[PDB]
Every structure is written in structure tokens, then in C-alpha cells.
Amino acid sequence: PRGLLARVITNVTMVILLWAVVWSVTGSECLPGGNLFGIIMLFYCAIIGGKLFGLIKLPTLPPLPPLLGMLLAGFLIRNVPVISDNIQIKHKWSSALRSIALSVILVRAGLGLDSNALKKLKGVCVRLSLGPCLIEACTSAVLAYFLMGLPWQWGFMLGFVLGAVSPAVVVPSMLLLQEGGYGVEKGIPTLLMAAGSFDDILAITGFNTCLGMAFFNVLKGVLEVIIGVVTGLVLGFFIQYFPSSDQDNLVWKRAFLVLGLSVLAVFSSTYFGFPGSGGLCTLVTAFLAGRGWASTKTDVEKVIAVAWDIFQPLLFGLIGAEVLITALRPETIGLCVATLGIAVLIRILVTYLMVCFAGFNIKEKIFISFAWLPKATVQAAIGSVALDTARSHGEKQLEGYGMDVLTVAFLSIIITAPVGSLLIGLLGPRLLQ
Amino acid sequence: PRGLLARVITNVTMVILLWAVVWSVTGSECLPGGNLFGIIMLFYCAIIGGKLFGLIKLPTLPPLPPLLGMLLAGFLIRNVPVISDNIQIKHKWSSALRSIALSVILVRAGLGLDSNALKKLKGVCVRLSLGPCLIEACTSAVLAYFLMGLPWQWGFMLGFVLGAVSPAVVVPSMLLLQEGGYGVEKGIPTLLMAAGSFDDILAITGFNTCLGMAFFNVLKGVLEVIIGVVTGLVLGFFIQYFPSSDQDNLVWKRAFLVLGLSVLAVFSSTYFGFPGSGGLCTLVTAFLAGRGWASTKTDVEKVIAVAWDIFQPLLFGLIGAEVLITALRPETIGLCVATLGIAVLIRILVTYLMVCFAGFNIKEKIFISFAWLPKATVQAAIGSVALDTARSHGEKQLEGYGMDVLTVAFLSIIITAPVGSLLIGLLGPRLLQ
Ligand SMILES: CC(C)CCC[C@@H](C)[C@H]1CC[C@H]2[C@@H]3CC=C4C[C@@H](OC(=O)CCC(=O)O)CC[C@]4(C)[C@H]3CC[C@]12C
Ligand SMILES: CC(C)CCC[C@@H](C)[C@H]1CC[C@H]2[C@@H]3CC=C4C[C@@H](OC(=O)CCC(=O)O)CC[C@]4(C)[C@H]3CC[C@]12C
Ligand SMILES: CC(C)CCC[C@@H](C)[C@H]1CC[C@H]2[C@@H]3CC=C4C[C@@H](OC(=O)CCC(=O)O)CC[C@]4(C)[C@H]3CC[C@]12C
Ligand SMILES: CC(C)CCC[C@@H](C)[C@H]1CC[C@H]2[C@@H]3CC=C4C[C@@H](OC(=O)CCC(=O)O)CC[C@]4(C)[C@H]3CC[C@]12C
Ligand SMILES: CC(C)CCC[C@@H](C)[C@H]1CC[C@H]2[C@@H]3CC=C4C[C@@H](OC(=O)CCC(=O)O)CC[C@]4(C)[C@H]3CC[C@]12C
Ligand SMILES: CC(C)CCC[C@@H](C)[C@H]1CC[C@H]2[C@@H]3CC=C4C[C@@H](OC(=O)CCC(=O)O)CC[C@]4(C)[C@H]3CC[C@]12C
Ligand SMILES: CC(C)CCC[C@@H](C)[C@H]1CC[C@H]2[C@@H]3CC=C4C[C@@H](OC(=O)CCC(=O)O)CC[C@]4(C)[C@H]3CC[C@]12C
Ligand SMILES: CC(C)CCC[C@@H](C)[C@H]1CC[C@H]2[C@@H]3CC=C4C[C@@H](OC(=O)CCC(=O)O)CC[C@]4(C)[C@H]3CC[C@]12C
């Protein structure tokens, strides 16, 4: 009956019951070496890993983010030889589960976005979404040439992979800051959430175009923008009108509609052959339907919030589950760190410059500069795409260049992701109060 | 903006959207001939079938139950030549889905049982669950010998299969009657729900033993009663104490615990080798948990009721999905019809006699006598077990005897399942008012 004892006892039963129930219905998928056993065990390990980082090993002054534990828990499973064969996850299950978690964070960001602030920040959004991304790519190519044997063709390809803000790490931080409030709320959380959502299409277009040259598509990148806007706009108007207050259980009807269409848009676009259209399609759909509701949007986000907590450990467990290749390969990776360090440093400076027009006087520029660091999702999506092509085509010289790209690609998530989440967490309540 | 137009538009969108979403994640399972296409189409056909029987062809006086539509919808799929390979379903996903729906109705029946009435009905419950089951089986064996070539060995086997009350047909009707109330509520709804729950152990024990004799097990049938009581008690006292009001989201925590352990007991018991223990294990577990949840028992009920509505069309659609063998086989089934007709009539008389002790004065006897007719679930599970051994044990003489079991076993589901459900509908509010 004790509160502390009841909480620990209940959770232990509710986790053993989940494994036991699945093992009964499915004959062998829940035994060691099975497909459902790898997913369940990784889900449990990521859950416990986050709890340790913040409740037992919490630093006095800085609150250690739980995102570090989730990546660490997945890293140990993939790299430990004795816990790498009894637990395995199929690539097609990893990719399917990876994209579903991405759509959940996108709809929640757009759904809670305030449209009034977005109207006055039209000019700032395009500058923020174009400045740091393009500038860093050019610097990365120059930095790589003087410190690596990669030519200009492979120098530019690295830059686009490196420079892309991941919404999965900034969006959860912005929403928590906005809920607390600080008496100003100029629109910084809204600006950061919107700008980082559609930055992916710029990066993927350059990577594919550069990859093809080293092996046209310039117009194709523009088409992905048009399709996502048109599909998101037309479908967004059939959610605020057809579902009305007349029907019952409307809370569970407006929640399945937005999430179901978001999943359809993401997976359908990739199948056709123009990925990235669903990246912003689910942003416009939720944003348009978001303005249609002005009384029941409060209870819809609560349903989505519980869903995000389920996919939070699962998403980052999969992200840090393919770093076994570079687990321990000391080959003077100081140059790789040097390229990453300079590129990050240059990105900070340009971000401050791009917001020097008006409004943001002193602290807004500082907070925005340090909030553009995290790089989690897009880096792992196309991190090893180039290396596989080099291996496939039958050559070898290009494979070595691709391996170098992998080292810097995985290094960004390990380094810049946990630091960015930690910095944004404690500096938000200290600059724009 | 119109509710009439909104429901049809909204419901149509919510069914096409579900198919499109599942089709995107799974490449070919959503296409015709796939595994997930059979489950989706069968659920949709059974859904409209229930709506037609009550909104289009509703009789004036007798309300035609949706069960007739659900049984017919699955019947057409399995028998129509052109829609019998376009939609299919694996046996292992039919059996898994069949048992899960059975556990839902058991916990919802046990949860709504009233303890006060059960205390005074010790004598009536045991007599009701023993009288008709044994008496009807004996009459079926005698009638079969004088009207068929089945010897005494096969006569009793047919009787035990034929004599069994299905809880999935009465409990939904009993719960609705109890909720409405009629100013007396002597305990008839509680008597019928409890007595019919544990009637499975006798029917399976007789059928298995009789089949073995024609091919000791009395002791094992006894253990299934003991095992269910022992595990029902220990697992029933760890649910009304640990999950308490201190925990958050307690509504969704107690509903996962009762339903999760009910599924575990049913599937785990079958695997070990003593089925039927989980049938009454989840009945006692849910009843004991109800006694501790004095206040929040009704709040959890709203979630279980919605769960059954999902499995209502799926359960009966699968029930009428294996009648292709006897789709159209005119072989003078009048003897089979005559044997079933006599057995049903004899069952009515004996049930009236068994409850002529006290309490039920005049009208209660008539209502209870006709409320023991519905027979749908247990028949289909063990109906074709005899014929499976006949075509697999190498003997062809016994194949004819097994075929006669299928004719009567499948004929009872078509006839008595809908009539019994319809009979209680228009007779309940006319006898215990
Ligand atoms: C703790 C509360 C929530 C009740 C749930 C208990 C379950 C966790 C128990 C009940 C039956 C047990 C199972 C019954 C027997 C076995 C022996 C063994 O099963 C096997 O046959 C595979 C290995 C072998 O060949 O022995 C492995 C564990 C297992 C499945 C047990 C695992 C744990 C189970 C599911
Ligand atoms: C907080 C922890 C419990 C989260 C889950 C960690 C898992 C990764 C651990 C927990 C229990 C461990 C398992 C305990 C027993 C075994 C059986 C073992 O196989 C043998 O024992 C073979 C020895 C023989 O020849 O008899 C293989 C590893 C495995 C699945 C272990 C692998 C790693 C597991 C799943
Ligand atoms: C605080 C919470 C998050 C801890 C969760 C603990 C789980 C990781 C434990 C609880 C029950 C354990 C399981 C209990 C029974 C078994 C059966 C066992 O089967 C064998 O011994 C394999 C024999 C063979 O080699 O064939 C393998 C480990 C396993 C799945 C255990 C794995 C680890 C489990 C899931
Ligand atoms: C935002 C998207 C939708 C439209 C813009 C796509 C850009 C990413 C493409 C368009 C023109 C491309 C550039 C044009 C040609 C080259 C040559 C390429 O390889 C060379 O340096 C050798 C050139 C030579 O001398 O032949 C280096 C990158 C670069 C600048 C390309 C980099 C990627 C660019 C900027
Ligand atoms: C209606 C509202 C909820 C928007 C959802 C529309 C979907 C129902 C559409 C969008 C993309 C369409 C699919 C894209 C193309 C095709 C052609 C075709 O796919 C194939 O290539 C296999 C058969 C063949 O060889 O042509 C069959 C239908 C399908 C999958 C379409 C089926 C219907 C889909 C899923
Ligand atoms: C209220 C109704 C719509 C519920 C669902 C009924 C389904 C059983 C129907 C609806 C659409 C029908 C399908 C429409 C088209 C086809 C394609 C057909 O294949 C061909 O046309 C091949 C012709 C050729 O050889 O070129 C096979 C049947 C199928 C899947 C039909 C089978 C039965 C379906 C699935
Ligand atoms: C009132 C509600 C319950 C009616 C529900 C209607 C559904 C039965 C319809 C809506 C969308 C239809 C599907 C839309 C697209 C396709 C792809 C289509 O693919 C082909 O043409 C097969 C070509 C080939 O033979 O390879 C087959 C029919 C199908 C599955 C249709 C089947 C019937 C569906 C599910
Ligand atoms: C509640 C459950 C767990 C216990 C009840 C078990 C009964 C269903 C068993 C116990 C003794 C069995 C009977 C004992 C022997 C026979 C002979 C059997 O076959 C014969 O008639 C030939 C006998 C011979 O060789 O002379 C037919 C049924 C019957 C009455 C059996 C039918 C089923 C009975 C009643």
C-alpha cells in the first residue's frame, strides 16, 4: 500500500506481463533470437537507461538529459559480442519503426504551433532555413580538402550530410519551454519548430545530386516542395469540416485522422520515388487543422503526448544501434573531429549573423545560436547510403572515402546531440526571462 | 455540417484510411490474396452485415439480431467461388483471434457479476450446469442409434459436442437486460452468466474421453477445475491490492492487468495440455478483482465494452468461415435435422425441471428455459476434431461417422444461435416485468 513500494512493484509486473502475453500468442518470436524479442528487449533497455541518467548519476548543477542514456543503451547492445547475436532486429523493421516515430513529433510540432507569430516571422524563417545549412556545406568541403584526400566531389557530399537540424531533439525542448512560459514569448519557440521541420528537403536534394555527379535532379527537389504543399493543403481542409461535434467519441476520431494521414503521407511518398514530400505534408496538414479547432485542441495533444513517450525510447534506441562498424577503430580520427569541430563552430557564427535584422536584440540571438546544434535523425538516415553504393558498384577507392564519411556521420550524433539537448534545457530559462 | 451526411462521410473515410495506412507499411499484405487483406475485408463485410439486419430488413415485431448478418457475411466469402480465393485467412490467425475474443467476453461477464445474488444461489447454479449437459448427451446417443448408423461409442461423442451453451451469445444479452432493470432483479442475469461460464470443462472432458475410448482422462478433467481455482485465487489477490489510487492513469492500468492476465491464462493453459482451466481462471480472477474495486469498477467497464464492439463482428465472421464443407450437400439431412430437433426440445423440458425447486415461480422458468438454447462458440472449436483424426488415422470406414458429426454440429450453429439470441430479445421484457 506504500506509494514508493507500489510504484516499483506495479511497473515490474506490467513489464513481465507484456513479454509473457506476446510469447503465448506467438510461438517463437518472443524467445531469444526472435524478431519480437529484439524489439521488446531494446525497448526495455532504453527505458531503464533514461531513468539512470537523471535520477542516480544526475550532476548537481547541470541536469543530464535522458537522451544520452537511450543512445548508450542501444550502443551497448549492438557492440557487445555476447549480447549481439541472441538479440537482433531486422533492417525493414528498423526503418518502418524509425519513420513512424518521426511522423509523431512532426504532427505534434505543427499542431501546437501558433499561427499569429508565424505571420510576422515570414522573412526570418527562410533565412534561418537557408543560411546555416548552405554555408556549413561550403565550409565542410573546404575543410575536408585541406585535411583529407577527398576531392571536391566528395567534399560537398559530406557537407550536406553534416548540416541538418533534427526536429526530434529541438521540438520536445521548445514545447516544454513554451508550456512553462516566461512572460514574453516573442515567437522564438514557434520560429524554431517551423524552420527546422522542412530543412530536410534542402539537404537530401544536394546529397543526391552530388552523389549522382560522382557516379537533372535539381528540378526534382523543387517538385517535392510543390507536391507536399498541395497534398497537405487539400487534405487539411477535409479535417476541420467533415468531422463535427455531432458525432460521439470525437476525441479519438480527430486523433486517428491526423496520425493516420501523416503515416500515409510519409510512406506513400517514399514508395513512389520522391521522398521528403511527406516531411512537410504532415506539417501543413496538422497546422491547417490546428487552426480549425479552438476548443478541443487541448485534449488532442494530451493523447499525442502519451504516444510520443512510447516512441521516445524506441526511436533513439534504433538510432544508436548501427555504430558497431566504428565501435573501436583508432586510425587518427583527430582530423575527423577537427573537421566536425570547425564546421560546428562556423555554424554557430552564421546562425547569429542571420538573425541580426530586427527584434532579436541580444539574448534572442544567443539562444537561437545554441539551439541549432542537435543532429539526430537525418544523419543516420543517409549516413551509410554512399558507402553501400561504393561497395556495390564493385570498386574500392571510393569505399575508403565512404568509410571516412561514416566516421564523421556517426560522430555528430554521439557528440552534438546530447550536448545540444543539455544546453537548450538549462539556458532557455536564463536568457529570455 | 449536417450530422446525417457527416456520419456516412466520416465513417467511410475512417474505413478507407485504415486500409491505406496498413497497405503502406506492408508492401503486399494489403493487396488481394495477402494475409492482412483477408482480415480487413472480413471485418468490413461483417460490419455492414450487422447494420443491414436492423436498419434495412428489420421486422416489425421481431428485432432481427445482427448475429444473423455476421454469420451470413462470412458464409458467402467461404462459399462463393469467385470471392473464395480473393479473401483468405490462415488457420493459426483464425485460432489466435478466436480465443482472444472469447477472453474479452469472459472478463466482462465476470466483472459485472453481483456477489450478493451468487451467495444464495449455491444449489441452483450447480444443478443448472450439470442437468441439461448430461441429460441431452444421453438423449442424443439414444436417438442417433435409432436414426443413424453410429454405434454407442460415437453416439455419446455427438451428444457432448451438441450439448453446450455458448457464453458469447447470452452474456451480451444478459448484460443489456441487467442494465435496464425491471424492478426485481432477483438474480437471474447473474445466475445465467456464472453457470454457463464453466460449462466447458464437462463438454470437453466427455468428448475427449469418448474419442479416446473409440481410438484415464477423468482425472485430468478434474485437475482442470482445481488448477483454475488455485491460480484464480493467487492471481486474484495480487490485483485488488498493488494497483491503487496512488498511481496515475489508473484507469488504463487496471484494464490492461485484468485483460492481459486473462489472455495469458487462456493461451498458456492450452500450450501445457489442459485446456479449459483458463475458461474459469479468468472468470474468478475478474470476479475477485471486482470485489476490491467498489467504486472504479464501472469506470473500467466503459473500456471493456468498447473492446468487445471491435471483436463482435470479427468473432462471428470467423465462426461462419469454415462451412464450405457443408455449403450445399443434400444427403437426406432430415435425419440429422430430426435428431437435432428432438434434442433441442428435450433440453427445454429438462431445464424447466432442474429449476423447479424454489424462487422461480412461473415466468422465470419459461425465460430461463429458452435462455439456454444459444450454442455457437464451443461447437465450432471441437466440431471437426473427430473428422481430422478420421482422415489422418488411416481409416476410411470411420470417415462417414465423422461426417455426420459435422452436419449436425454446423447445422446447430446456423439454426439455434440466431433464434436463441432473437428469442431472448423479445421475451425478456415480457416475463420478468
Ligand atoms: C509473473 C506473473 C506476471 C505471471 C506470468 C508468469 C510467466 C512469466 C511464466 C508462466 C509460464 C512460464 C513459462 C513456462 C515454461 C517455460 C520453460 C521454457 O520454455 C521452453 O520450452 C523453451 C526452452 C526449453 O526448451 O526448455 C522457458 C521458460 C518458460 C516458457 C516459462 C517462462 C515464464 C512463464 C511464461
Ligand atoms: C535489466 C535487464 C534484465 C534488461 C534485459 C537484459 C537482457 C539483454 C538479458 C536479461 C536475461 C539475459 C538472458 C539470460 C539467459 C540467456 C540464455 C543463454 O543461453 C544459454 O544459457 C546456453 C548455455 C547452455 O549451453 O546451456 C543465452 C543468453 C540469454 C538469452 C541471456 C541474454 C541477455 C538477457 C536477455
Ligand atoms: C525492471 C525491468 C525493466 C526488468 C525486466 C526483466 C526482464 C528482462 C526479465 C523478466 C522475465 C525474464 C525472462 C524469464 C524467462 C526466460 C526464459 C529463458 O529460457 C531459457 O532459459 C533458454 C533455454 C535454452 O537455451 O533453450 C530465457 C530468458 C527469459 C526470456 C527471461 C529473460 C529476461 C526477462 C524477460
Ligand atoms: C535547393 C535545391 C532544391 C536546389 C539547389 C540544388 C543545389 C544543391 C545544386 C544545384 C547546382 C549544384 C552545384 C553545381 C556544380 C557543382 C560541381 C561539383 O563538382 C565540382 O566541383 C567540379 C565542377 C567542374 O569543374 O566540372 C561541386 C558542387 C557543385 C557546386 C554543385 C553542388 C550542388 C548544387 C548547388
Ligand atoms: C482516400 C483518402 C483516404 C486518401 C488515400 C488514397 C489512397 C487510397 C491511394 C493513394 C495512393 C494509392 C495507391 C497508389 C497506386 C496504386 C496502383 C496499384 O498498385 C500496384 O502497382 C499493384 C497493382 C498493379 O500492378 O498495378 C494498385 C492501387 C494503388 C496501390 C493505389 C491504391 C489507393 C492509394 C493507396
Ligand atoms: C462493400 C464491399 C465493397 C466490401 C469489400 C468487398 C470485396 C470482397 C470486393 C471489393 C473490390 C473487389 C475486388 C475488385 C478487383 C479485383 C481485381 C481482380 O483481378 C482482376 O481483375 C484480373 C483481371 C485480368 O486478368 O486482367 C480480382 C478480384 C478483385 C481483388 C475484387 C475482389 C473482391 C473485392 C475485394
Ligand atoms: C462502406 C465501406 C465498408 C466500403 C469499403 C470499400 C472498400 C472495400 C474499397 C475502398 C478502396 C478499395 C481498394 C482500392 C484499391 C485497390 C487496388 C486494386 O488493385 C488492382 O487493381 C489489382 C490489379 C491486379 O490484378 O494485379 C484492387 C482493389 C483495391 C484493393 C480496392 C479494394 C476495395 C476497397 C478497399
Ligand atoms: C465432469 C467430468 C470431469 C467427469 C465425468 C466423466 C464422464 C463423462 C465419463 C466417465 C465414465 C464414462 C462412461 C463409462 C463407459 C462408457 C462406455 C462407452 O462405450 C461403450 O458403450 C462400450 C462399453 C463396453 O465395452 O461394454 C460409452 C460411454 C460410457 C458410458 C462413458 C461415457 C463418459 C463417462 C460417463
Swiss-Prot record, chains A, B:
Catalytic activity as recorded in UniProt? Li(+)(out) + H(+)(in) = Li(+)(in) + H(+)(out); Li(+)(in) + Na(+)(out) = Li(+)(out) + Na(+)(in); Na(+)(in) + H(+)(out) = Na(+)(out) + H(+)(in)
Q: Which residues lie on this side of the membrane: Extracellular?
A: 26-34, 83-92, 149-154, 273-276, 327-332, 389-401
GO terms for cellular component:
apical plasma membrane; basolateral plasma membrane; endosome membrane; lysosomal membrane; mitochondrial membrane; plasma membrane; recycling endosome; recycling endosome membrane
Q: What else is known?
A: The subcellular localization of SLC9B2 remains controversial. Was initially thought to partially localize to mitochondria. However SLC9B2 does not seem to contain a mitochondrial targeting sequence. It was later established that its localizes predominantly in plasma membrane or intracellularly to endosomes and lysosomes. In another recent study, endogenous SLC9B2 in the distal tubular cell line mpkDCT4 is detected in recycling endosomes but absent in plasma membrane.
Mechanisms controlling activity: Allosterically inhibited by the N-terminal domain. Inhibited by phloretin.
Biological function: Electroneutral Na(+) Li(+)/H(+) antiporter that extrudes Na(+) or Li(+) in exchange for external protons across the membrane. Uses the proton gradient/membrane potential to extrude sodium. Contributes to the regulation of intracellular pH and sodium homeostasis. Also able to mediate Na(+)/Li(+) antiporter activity in kidney. May play a physiological role in renal tubular function and blood pressure homeostasis. Plays an important role for insulin secretion and clathrin-mediated endocytosis in beta-cells. Involved in sperm motility and fertility.
Q: Tell me the domain of life.
A: Eukaryota
- What are the GO BP annotations of this UniProt entry? clathrin-dependent endocytosis; flagellated sperm motility; lithium ion transport; positive regulation of osteoclast development; regulation of insulin secretion involved in cellular response to glucose stimulus; sodium ion homeostasis; sodium ion transport
Species classification: Eukaryota, Metazoa, Chordata, Craniata, Vertebrata
GO molecular function annotation: identical protein binding; lithium:proton antiporter activity; metal ion binding; sodium:proton antiporter activity
Mind telling me which residue stretches traverse the membrane in this protein? 8-25, 35-54, 66-82, 93-110, 122-148, 155-163, 192-211, 216-239, 255-272, 277-288, 306-326, 333-355, 377-388, 402-424
Q: Which residues lie on this side of the membrane: Cytoplasmic?
A: 55-65, 111-121, 164-191, 240-254, 289-305, 356-376
The reported effect of residue 136 to R is: Shifts the specificity from Na(+) to Li(+)
Keyword annotations: Cell membrane, Cell projection, Cilium, Cytoplasmic vesicle, Endosome, Flagellum, Lysosome, Membrane, Metal-binding, Mitochondrion, Sodium, Synapse, Transmembrane, Transmembrane helix
Q: Which residues bind Na(+)?
A: 165, 196, 199-200
Question: What is the source species?
Answer: Bison bison bison
Look up keyword Cell membrane and say if it applies: yes
Membrane topology of this protein: Multi-pass membrane protein
Name listed for the protein in its UniProt record: Sodium/hydrogen exchanger 9B2
